[PDB]
Scaffold this active site. Structure first.
Site, mmCIF file in Angstrom:
data_model
loop_
_atom_site.group_PDB
_atom_site.id
_atom_site.type_symbol
_atom_site.label_atom_id
_atom_site.label_comp_id
_atom_site.label_asym_id
_atom_site.label_seq_id
_atom_site.Cartn_x
_atom_site.Cartn_y
_atom_site.Cartn_z
ATOM 1 N N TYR A 179 0.849 -1.218 0.000
ATOM 2 C CA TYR A 179 0.000 0.000 0.000
ATOM 3 C C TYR A 179 0.873 1.253 0.000
ATOM 4 C CZ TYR A 179 0.789 1.495 4.799
ATOM 5 O OH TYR A 179 1.367 1.954 5.951
ATOM 6 N N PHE A 220 3.006 11.292 3.024
ATOM 7 C CA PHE A 220 3.184 10.060 2.210
ATOM 8 C C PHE A 220 3.738 8.921 3.067
ATOM 9 C CE2 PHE A 220 4.769 7.129 -0.961
ATOM 10 C CZ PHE A 220 3.781 7.172 -1.918
ATOM 11 N N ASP A 221 3.168 7.727 2.878
ATOM 12 C CA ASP A 221 3.503 6.489 3.635
ATOM 13 C C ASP A 221 3.363 5.278 2.699
ATOM 14 O OD1 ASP A 221 3.600 4.466 5.743
ATOM 15 O OD2 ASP A 221 1.399 4.592 5.797
ATOM 16 N N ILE A 247 -8.553 1.452 9.957
ATOM 17 C CA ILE A 247 -9.683 2.412 9.753
ATOM 18 C C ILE A 247 -10.832 1.684 9.032
ATOM 19 C CG2 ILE A 247 -8.398 4.561 9.880
ATOM 20 C CD1 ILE A 247 -8.243 4.516 6.781
ATOM 21 N N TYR A 285 -10.421 8.965 10.224
ATOM 22 C CA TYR A 285 -9.973 9.477 11.550
ATOM 23 C C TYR A 285 -10.937 10.538 12.111
ATOM 24 C CZ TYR A 285 -5.770 6.793 10.697
ATOM 25 O OH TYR A 285 -4.892 5.785 10.441
ATOM 26 N N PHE A 317 -5.451 6.027 -0.799
ATOM 27 C CA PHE A 317 -4.674 4.768 -0.773
ATOM 28 C C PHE A 317 -4.663 4.115 -2.146
ATOM 29 C CE2 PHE A 317 -5.692 5.219 3.749
ATOM 30 C CZ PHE A 317 -4.490 4.912 4.339
HETATM 31 C C1 LIG Z 1 -10.164 0.870 14.503
HETATM 32 O O1 LIG Z 1 -9.714 2.185 14.083
HETATM 33 C C2 LIG Z 1 -8.331 2.374 14.009
HETATM 34 C C3 LIG Z 1 -7.409 1.348 13.753
HETATM 35 C C4 LIG Z 1 -6.043 1.653 13.712
HETATM 36 C C5 LIG Z 1 -5.583 2.960 13.882
HETATM 37 C C6 LIG Z 1 -4.186 3.262 13.846
HETATM 38 C C7 LIG Z 1 -3.604 3.579 12.448
HETATM 39 C C8 LIG Z 1 -3.577 2.363 11.476
HETATM 40 O O2 LIG Z 1 -3.449 2.848 10.126
HETATM 41 C C9 LIG Z 1 -4.587 2.799 9.351
HETATM 42 O O3 LIG Z 1 -5.722 2.646 9.805
HETATM 43 C C10 LIG Z 1 -4.402 3.091 7.969
HETATM 44 C C11 LIG Z 1 -4.730 1.900 7.066
HETATM 45 C C12 LIG Z 1 -3.594 0.921 7.124
HETATM 46 C C13 LIG Z 1 -2.338 1.641 6.596
HETATM 47 C C14 LIG Z 1 -1.902 2.700 7.553
HETATM 48 N N1 LIG Z 1 -3.018 3.646 7.769
HETATM 49 C C15 LIG Z 1 -2.862 5.015 7.838
HETATM 50 O O4 LIG Z 1 -3.874 5.699 8.031
HETATM 51 C C16 LIG Z 1 -1.603 5.668 7.747
HETATM 52 C C17 LIG Z 1 -1.656 7.132 7.195
HETATM 53 C C18 LIG Z 1 -2.075 7.141 5.708
HETATM 54 C C19 LIG Z 1 -2.377 8.529 5.275
HETATM 55 C C20 LIG Z 1 -1.041 9.279 5.359
HETATM 56 C C21 LIG Z 1 -0.493 9.264 6.815
HETATM 57 C C22 LIG Z 1 -0.284 7.868 7.308
HETATM 58 C C23 LIG Z 1 -0.940 5.679 9.007
HETATM 59 C C24 LIG Z 1 0.409 5.255 9.032
HETATM 60 C C25 LIG Z 1 1.135 5.257 10.224
HETATM 61 O O5 LIG Z 1 2.442 4.871 10.286
HETATM 62 C C26 LIG Z 1 2.845 3.783 9.438
HETATM 63 C C27 LIG Z 1 0.529 5.698 11.415
HETATM 64 C C28 LIG Z 1 -0.799 6.140 11.404
HETATM 65 O O6 LIG Z 1 -1.304 6.541 12.608
HETATM 66 C C29 LIG Z 1 -2.048 7.779 12.625
HETATM 67 C C30 LIG Z 1 -1.554 6.131 10.202
HETATM 68 O O7 LIG Z 1 1.281 5.737 12.591
HETATM 69 C C31 LIG Z 1 0.954 5.022 13.793
HETATM 70 C C32 LIG Z 1 1.704 3.755 13.784
HETATM 71 O O8 LIG Z 1 3.141 3.990 14.025
HETATM 72 C C33 LIG Z 1 3.940 2.886 13.529
HETATM 73 C C34 LIG Z 1 3.443 1.636 13.987
HETATM 74 C C35 LIG Z 1 2.659 0.738 13.216
HETATM 75 C C36 LIG Z 1 2.324 0.893 11.839
HETATM 76 O O9 LIG Z 1 1.091 1.605 11.607
HETATM 77 C C37 LIG Z 1 -0.133 1.052 11.830
HETATM 78 C C38 LIG Z 1 -0.380 -0.277 12.279
HETATM 79 C C39 LIG Z 1 -1.709 -0.700 12.451
HETATM 80 C C40 LIG Z 1 -2.780 0.167 12.192
HETATM 81 C C41 LIG Z 1 -2.531 1.479 11.744
HETATM 82 C C42 LIG Z 1 -1.212 1.895 11.582
HETATM 83 C C43 LIG Z 1 -6.505 3.954 14.126
HETATM 84 C C44 LIG Z 1 -7.851 3.685 14.171
HETATM 85 O O10 LIG Z 1 -8.743 4.676 14.440
HETATM 86 C C45 LIG Z 1 -9.605 5.127 13.377
#
Ligand SMILES: COc1ccc(CC[C@H]2OC(=O)[C@@H]3CCCCN3C(=O)[C@@H](C3CCCCC3)c3cc(OC)c(c(OC)c3)OCCOC/C=C\COc3cccc2c3)cc1OC
Length: 126
Positions: free
Chosen positions: A43, A53-54, A73, A99, A116
């Site tokens: 992704y 960007f990620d 999400i 979010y 995405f």
């Molecule tokens: C049930 O609802 C939720 C579930 C989970 C979360 C936590 C964030 C979750 O990320 C996501 O949901 C989505 C979809 C899967 C790809 C990552 N992602 C993101 O939104 C990205 C974000 C994409 C848009 C540009 C900025 C980064 C995105 C990427 C991120 O870093 C890779 C991120 C993040 O947190 C805000 C969101 O940082 C937090 C994590 O720090 C690093 C550790 C792990 C890797 O990231 C993860 C791992 C698991 C889940 C995710 C991130 C919040 C929720 O509330 C709505």
């Protein structure tokens, strides 16, 4: 992202355009992941305006999660649920399906629209 705004198919149950999808590359697969399936994806992710960007590629690792368990999400549980193996989808997401008004700072501003590009590598049950 503007293309998805114009051209993207609505894949929200309620059909509020909260989540919009373009199938860019068609998968070899005939099946989709079930809820409770372990999912394996490449992704790329950005805010609609190209910021923050990620990518899984940059992290040198696929993003593995179980479908329909709120690990990701709402937009991802909806979007990857539609996808076939080998498929590449484009998604434009309303904050309500990501979010919301709270956001998730510093990465996710208040009421942010996400983009995405997802490649579904595989999925398995058990
Ligand atoms: C049930 O609802 C939720 C579930 C989970 C979360 C936590 C964030 C979750 O990320 C996501 O949901 C989505 C979809 C899967 C790809 C990552 N992602 C993101 O939104 C990205 C974000 C994409 C848009 C540009 C900025 C980064 C995105 C990427 C991120 O870093 C890779 C991120 C993040 O947190 C805000 C969101 O940082 C937090 C994590 O720090 C690093 C550790 C792990 C890797 O990231 C993860 C791992 C698991 C889940 C995710 C991130 C919040 C929720 O509330 C709505």
């Amino acid at each position: 992202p503007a293309t998805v705004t114009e051209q993207g198919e609505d894949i929200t149950s309620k059909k509020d355009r909260g989540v919009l999808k373009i199938v860019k590359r068609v998968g070899n697969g005939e099946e989709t992941p079930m809820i409770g399936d372990k999912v394996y994806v490449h992704y790329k992710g950005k805010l609609s305006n190209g910021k923050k960007f990620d990518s899984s590629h940059d992290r040198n690792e696929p993003f593995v999660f179980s479908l329909g368990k709120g690990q990701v999400i709402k937009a991802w549980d909806i979007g990857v649920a539609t996808m076939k193996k080998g498929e590449i989808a484009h998604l434009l997401i309303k904050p309500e399906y990501a979010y919301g008004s709270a956001g998730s700072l510093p990465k996710i501003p208040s009421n942010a629209t996400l983009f995405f590009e997802i490649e579904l590598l595989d999925f398995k049950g058990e």
